[PDB]
Amino acid sequence: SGKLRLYKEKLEGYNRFYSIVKTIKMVTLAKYRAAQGRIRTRDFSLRYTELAFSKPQASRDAVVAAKNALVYIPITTNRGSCGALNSNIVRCIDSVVSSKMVLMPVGKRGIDSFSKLYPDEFRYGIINDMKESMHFGYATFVIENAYEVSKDADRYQVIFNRFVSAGVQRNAVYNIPSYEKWKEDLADAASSDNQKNRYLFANALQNEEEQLIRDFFDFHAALAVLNAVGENELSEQAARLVAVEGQLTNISSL
């Protein structure tokens, strides 16, 4: 009859969908493994970047104290089906809502999600085609656009996903204060006994010219952005596997 053939066609369509999703899983796992090589080569580029920007600070004073623009650069994936990464990033942004907040998200999903929720705190977004390897030029483009969005910005907070393991993708933050505040903190560390761990570093920077210091600041900011995007891509590939597995289970149940 027709209803019997209707169910037969529906089952055939589900089988085709399952096969396509399985191929997607294989392709994603290929890039997961292919770009799994980063794990051996990471965790050593950003060593003096820690000294430059790593500071244990409260989450309130740093927010309320500032009266200039607070730039935020959330990292988001172009294609959906990644998982809960974008949702968690949006939640983190929502918890930090302020009159000074400015958004320059990354990825199509981030743009489409922050344009509607935050229309008056959104200027424009950056998009990269996942064709080449995440390189320094992309990070420089992001930093230049962030500066042009708000040059008199108190800080530039980058929110990304850290791929701890195949099944653990936490949310991590890089804070990049303004050149003036960074200079003040550096001078305080160099002179005062406080910040004893950065004393040598600050004094070494002071001895050099100011153009070199500015280049150092920009260079390490770009390195942090590069690290963020790379970890986000790896987390996206892994995170993507979970979503694809969930879709496969749903299709099998259907």
Partner: peptide, 27 residues
């Protein structure tokens, strides 16, 4: 060459839906 090819662009969603491309920074 895969570490230098530019493949990044700046876009803003307009009312019509077109992705208005920005010229803030050269690519």
């Amino acid at each position: 060459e895969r570490w230098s090819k530019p493949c990044y662009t700046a876009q803003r969603p307009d009312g019509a839906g077109g992705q208005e491309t920005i010229d803030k920074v050269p690519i």
